[PDB]
Amino acid sequence: TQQEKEFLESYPQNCPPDALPGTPGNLDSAQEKALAELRKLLEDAGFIERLDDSTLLRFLRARKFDVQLAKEMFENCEKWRKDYGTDTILQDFHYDEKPLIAKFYPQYYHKTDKDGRPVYFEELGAVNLHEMNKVTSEERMLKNLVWEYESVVQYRLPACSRAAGHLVETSCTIMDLKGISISSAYSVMSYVREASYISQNYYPERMGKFYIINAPFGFSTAFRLFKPFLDPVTVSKIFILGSSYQKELLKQIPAENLPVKFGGKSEVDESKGGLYLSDIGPWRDPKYIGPEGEAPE
Numbered sequence: 001t002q003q004e005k006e007f008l009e010s011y012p013q014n015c016p017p018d019a020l021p022g023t024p025g026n027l028d029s030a031q032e033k034a035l036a037e038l039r040k041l042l043e044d045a046g047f048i049e050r051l052d053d054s055t056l057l058r059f060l061r062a063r064k065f066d067v068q069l070a071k072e073m074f075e076n077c078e079k080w081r082k083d084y085g086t087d088t089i090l091q092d093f094h095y096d097e098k099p100l101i102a103k104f105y106p107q108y109y110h111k112t113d114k115d116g117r118p119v120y121f122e123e124l125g126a127v128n129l130h131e132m133n134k135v136t137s138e139e140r141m142l143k144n145l146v147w148e149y150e151s152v153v154q155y156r157l158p159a160c161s162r163a164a165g166h167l168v169e170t171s172c173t174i175m176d177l178k179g180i181s182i183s184s185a186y187s188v189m190s191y192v193r194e195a196s197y198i199s200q201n202y203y204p205e206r207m208g209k210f211y212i213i214n215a216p217f218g219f220s221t222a223f224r225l226f227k228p229f230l231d232p233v234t235v236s237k238i239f240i241l242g243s244s245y246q247k248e249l250l251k252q253i254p255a256e257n258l259p260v261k262f263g264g265k266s267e268v269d270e271s272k273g274g275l276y277l278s279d280i281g282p283w284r285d286p287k288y289i290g291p292e293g294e295a296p297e
């Protein structure tokens with residue numbers, strides 16, 4: 001492609017050798033063969049974009065390296081990208097409402113975890129859709145979600161990879177449940193369902209860690225009891241914490257990267273409405289920004 005080539009060699013392309021098998025740089029024989037035949041099948045069908053190792057290995061991992069199922073998942077994704085306009089969302093969609101409604105559903109990226117992943121924060125427990133729907137719609141909240149996803153893929157992950165010295169394909173999510181009720185949980189359920197559907201089918205294998213904090217007692221207790229029955233890959237990725245989550249977060253995120261309100265030392269200018277409207281991280285550092293240029297605001 002010659003633009004993509006330049007871009008792909010501008011950040012580290014191998015995962016650390018202790019990552020899960022089937023990740024870039026960690027391929028078994030016939031995990032290399034499955035990658036090759038998936039590519040030629042997508043080429044024979046006329047696809048020319050997003051045929052890099054990282055991308056195709058995510059679709060393969062999501063289908064246990066069943067090549068035909070991974071191909072069908074990829075084709076389904078490209079069809080959604082065309083119907084939804086995803087390839088041009090960064091230029092077409094403008095979430096001008098965000099300063100008005102961010103406080104009614106706080107969502108923000110902030111710095112990185114110890115593995116180099118960008119950290120994504122979601123204060124779901126504070127959600128107030130009754131006030132949000134005075135100004136925006138669920139449809140526009142989802143466009144904004146995909147807008148941010150495209151910005152993670154095009155800008156944040158390449159910069160995080162450079163800052164980390166190795167390929168970074170995934171994020172660390174912190175979802176704060178402080179404040180949910182049964183009522184507000186039902187009110188946010190449709191958005192969460194659509195978001196999760198988009199994530200799993202169109203962004204497979206992008207979830208690296210997922211921490212729920214300030215979980216209600218019954219919710220946290222259910223997880224405590226059934227942990228022994230989750231596959232050990234899942235149990236190293238999902239954490240359901242109650243009120244005392246700070247020490248657990250600090251095992252995964254450097255204290256100088258974790259916001260103070262969650263037990264860390266990272267501070268933003270609260271006068272510029274900083275945390276809820278900030279986007280601080282290696283992707284805002286010129287020494288980690290490559291030929292793609294800096295991510296938009």
Ligand SMILES: O=C(c1ccc(Br)c([N+](=O)[O-])c1)N1CCN(c2ccccc2F)CC1
Nearest residue numbers: 122149152170171192195196199203206207
């Ligand atoms: O799978 C993902 C996910 C999807 C796409 C992308 Br580009 C990233 N990423 O690397 O930032 C993560 N997530 C896990 C589930 N997520 C989620 C789902 C429903 C509601 C709220 C959420 F935060 C979002 C993050």
